[PDB]
Amino acid sequence: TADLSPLLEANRKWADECAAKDSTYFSKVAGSQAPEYLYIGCADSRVSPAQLFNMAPGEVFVQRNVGNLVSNKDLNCMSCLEYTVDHLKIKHILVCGHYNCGACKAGLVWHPKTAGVTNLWISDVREVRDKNAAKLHGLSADDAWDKMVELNVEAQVFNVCASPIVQAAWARGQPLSVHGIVYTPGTGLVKELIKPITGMEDAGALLRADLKQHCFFSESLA
Amino acid sequence: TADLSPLLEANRKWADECAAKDSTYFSKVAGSQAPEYLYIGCADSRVSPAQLFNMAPGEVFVQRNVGNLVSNKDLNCMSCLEYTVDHLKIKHILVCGHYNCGACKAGLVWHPKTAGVTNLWISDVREVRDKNAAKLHGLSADDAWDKMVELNVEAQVFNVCASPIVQAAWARGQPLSVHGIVYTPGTGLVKELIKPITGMEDAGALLRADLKQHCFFSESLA
Amino acid sequence: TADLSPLLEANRKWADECAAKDSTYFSKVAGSQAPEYLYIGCADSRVSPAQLFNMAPGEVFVQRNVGNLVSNKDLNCMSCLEYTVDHLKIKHILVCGHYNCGACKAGLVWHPKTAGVTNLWISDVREVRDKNAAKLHGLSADDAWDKMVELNVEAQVFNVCASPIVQAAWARGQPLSVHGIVYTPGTGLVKELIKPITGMEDAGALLRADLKQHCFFSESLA
Amino acid sequence: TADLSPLLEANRKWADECAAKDSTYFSKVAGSQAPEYLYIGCADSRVSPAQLFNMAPGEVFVQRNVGNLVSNKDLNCMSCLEYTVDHLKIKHILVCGHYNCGACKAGLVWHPKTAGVTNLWISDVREVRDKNAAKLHGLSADDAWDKMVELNVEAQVFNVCASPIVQAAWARGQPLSVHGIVYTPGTGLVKELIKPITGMEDAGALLRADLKQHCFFSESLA
Ligand SMILES: CC(=O)Nc1nnc(S(N)(=O)=O)s1
Ligand SMILES: CC(=O)Nc1nnc(S(N)(=O)=O)s1
Ligand SMILES: CC(=O)Nc1nnc(S(N)(=O)=O)s1
Ligand SMILES: CC(=O)Nc1nnc(S(N)(=O)=O)s1
Ligand SMILES: [Cl-]
Ligand SMILES: [Cl-]
Ligand SMILES: [Zn+2]
Ligand SMILES: [Zn+2]
Ligand SMILES: [Zn+2]
Ligand SMILES: [Zn+2]
């Protein structure tokens, strides 16, 4: 059966207990939100940002897609970025990858001829991979996987920092930080991969790739 | 200001307590997932699917985006759908809108010349709206907003049922149900807007738009 | 063989004759362009806009895709629109469909479960189709095809007029017209389907769908 | 100002003369096409493929977009590619850049905070640029611009060869060649930047990026 009764019952029991412990738990967000965080993470069923950070409704705005990817040409992720940064004025963007991420493994192993949309989607993972032969080759299957996850976080942090939305927000002096983090489904713990990046100065210090030259390329020419 | 230790500490507290309540809580999903559900919902910070359904990790795979939109030409939501239906073999897709959704309100009130990627992204909403313009005619602002949310949930349920991925899964006799639900941020409760749709028969019964005609349109030419 | 010699030879012979008849034919566009037209048409090999209009280099900027489709969420077509309208200040946008357009036929006949990217792409054609059962049903295969082509032109003209780019240009008083036209591969002739639309006043007169209500929807509510 | 009769009349003049020179010119492509080529080139008004190769209708299927970009996650250029390779069985794909391409120049000079969809769309160009930053270092503006155009043609040739569609066609032994060419708007001439690539062997010989490593990367893990 496809009956939803038991699901709905679990929700009702949850909202009942929540509101019993704190009468304004839901009511205070009945007509507005003011989260301080955007989280961009993987769609993987093991990785729920509000649960894992013990956040209540109204604290974290969420984009989740296969592989936690950020591209300037993806209107879905870019709309979550633009709405949160420009209208909600969130303060912090958490870019979260996770170990055991099948999208990262498929990015390592699949032949690109593979049919379907997921294989198109994870092209970004191949691009990150391809720039890192030297860190990936010769590693055990497992270690290569872990490394791919990590490299993917770093690249997606760079993409968030280089995004027109973040770049415009920094240029107008809006406070905005970007965090590279990674989660372990099998332990429920988050680790910090990259320390906070609050602007171009921190990005030059903390990112391998050169954000400054990316933004001001013309200054590297004759 | 931007330091993460407080968040990390909340995450550690949380993981210890879950491990203390059940020591296989995380470890049993360390290397695989077998969720039964895919949830497609809004990125709004007040709506966290695993939390609101009181699910543990490994139970609901998640796509969240501004206004809970589903289009065959978004590779972001389409890859969540492909991976879950084709590879994980989920059984149920929950398509969840929410009252007080500002993407629905913007789809009613914004002029389309408005700059930025969010206005591009909510084009889908304007189309749902335009197709149902007579239903929205003359309603108070609040009523029109609530009706916009509901019409959009019905439209995204139709889009999920009409998708190549779901249509192909049904053609091969894979059991797969689609659910139109709505959440009220001010109460924490889910309501079922549309009963379970398990196939074409259900869709003919339950949807205002004609899925059979969409799938077999050319049978009505001379 | 994949040798390009004969192709290159045909090009050299062409550029030689062109420049022999008119010494500045190429040189005057060696370092800038100032076209007055954007053309959005089908990628079909039988339909070449500069040939069919007898235009020389520098007169018509071109987007061509399968089915001549225009969506606010397609960065490829939207970049051609934005660059031409905002930077080149073109004056006229030709939206050209063509009879015998296999994309329009596939939009009529394909089952949506059909695999691959083209089937995703032509979802727009289904949406136009779906809004027109009354004009399509009961027609011969051939007449339905022709009608689909025509309806698709009209819808894509509306999409160009409703685009944020065109809407912004009209709001600042930039002169910009939009033309619905159709080509017959088997005769080489263009026909005018919709007369010129130079702004909101003409669009209310010449488009079936209501552009004004689309742009100012809020004014239809209580 | 916006009336089309002059354009329509040029079109009639042109069609009569072609029919007068050869009375089966149009009629022989009235109901089908069998082009041998797919051309992917820039939307720039100075570059019209059928004209510059002196082709009649039915010879070259065309995708044109700002900066002649090819990405697996653009359904617009991917559907041109799928339809031609899989259904029309074209033999040759021409990937054509052009000197004096302002999309290449913007990819060197724009800051990424720049508003609008064109800046999103040329992100691909910035990535080609960033990967080849040492080649562009210290060149005069003109030299860097010409080198940008060339590096982008090579990158889009690689992207075409790496695409699922071409890779699958080669895996099935379909003959299909890919060509890197460049056009000079000021002279009307095409130059061949990269010799014909007919398969993996050719690609290994001719491309600066390693297509074999992209396709079989995981063979180099432990
Ligand atoms: C083909 C493919 O993407 N495989 C995946 N496996 N696990 C995934 S996860 N972490 O995104 O849920 S995606
Ligand atoms: C322009 C716009 O989209 N406004 C939004 N307001 N709330 C949104 S929500 N519910 O997606 O967080 S989107
Ligand atoms: C599946 C599909 O799209 N079929 C096509 N047939 N002809 C086309 S055309 N006019 O775009 O070249 S596309
Ligand atoms: C910002 C930008 O893209 N500028 C352009 N200039 N010329 C272009 S062309 N060769 O695509 O017509 S694009
Ligand atoms: Cl979530
Ligand atoms: Cl063309
Ligand atoms: Zn994952
Ligand atoms: Zn919402
Ligand atoms: Zn066509
Ligand atoms: Zn160009």
Residue numbers in the entry:
A (entry chain A), B (entry chain B), C (entry chain A), D (entry chain B): 6 to 227
The study reports:
Carbonic anhydrases (CAs, EC 4.2.1.1) are metalloenzymes, which catalyze the reversible hydration of carbon dioxide. In order to learn more about the molecular mechanism of β-CA, we have determined the crystal structure of β-CA from Coccomyxa (Co-CA) in complex with five inhibitors: acetazolamide, thiocyanate, azide, iodide, and phosphate ions. Co-CA is a homo-tetrameric structure with one dimer present in the asymmetric unit. The catalytic zinc ion binds to the side chains of residues Cys-47, His-103, and Cys-106 in a tetrahedral geometry with the fourth ligand expected to be a water molecule in the native enzyme.
The structure of Co-CA in complex with acetazolamide, Co-CA-AZM, was refined at 1.9 Å. The maps show well-defined electron density for the entire acetazolamide molecule and for a neighboring glycerol molecule, both before and after refinement. The binding and orientation of AZM in Co-CA is similar to what has been observed in human CAII, and human CAI. The amide group of the sulfonamide part of the inhibitor is situated 2.0 Å from the zinc atom and positioned in a tetrahedral geometry. Furthermore, the amide group forms a hydrogen bond to the Oδ2 atom of Asp-49 (3.1 Å). The O1 atom of the sulfonamide group forms a hydrogen bond to the Nδ2 atom of Gln-38′ (3.0 Å), whereas the last oxygen of the group forms no hydrogen bonds but is in van der Waals' contacts with Val-71 and Ala-108. The direction of the inhibitor is restricted by its thiadiazole ring, which is sandwiched at the "channel gate". The two nitrogen atoms in the thiadiazole ring form hydrogen bonds to a water and a glycerol molecule, respectively. The nitrogen of the N-acetamido group forms a hydrogen bond to a water molecule, whereas the acetamido group itself is buried in a rather hydrophobic part of the active site cleft. The Ki of acetazolamide binding to Co-CA is 1 µM, which can be compared to the Ki values of acetazolamide binding to human CAII, human CAI, and pea CA with 0.01 µM, 0.2 µM, and 28 µM, respectively.
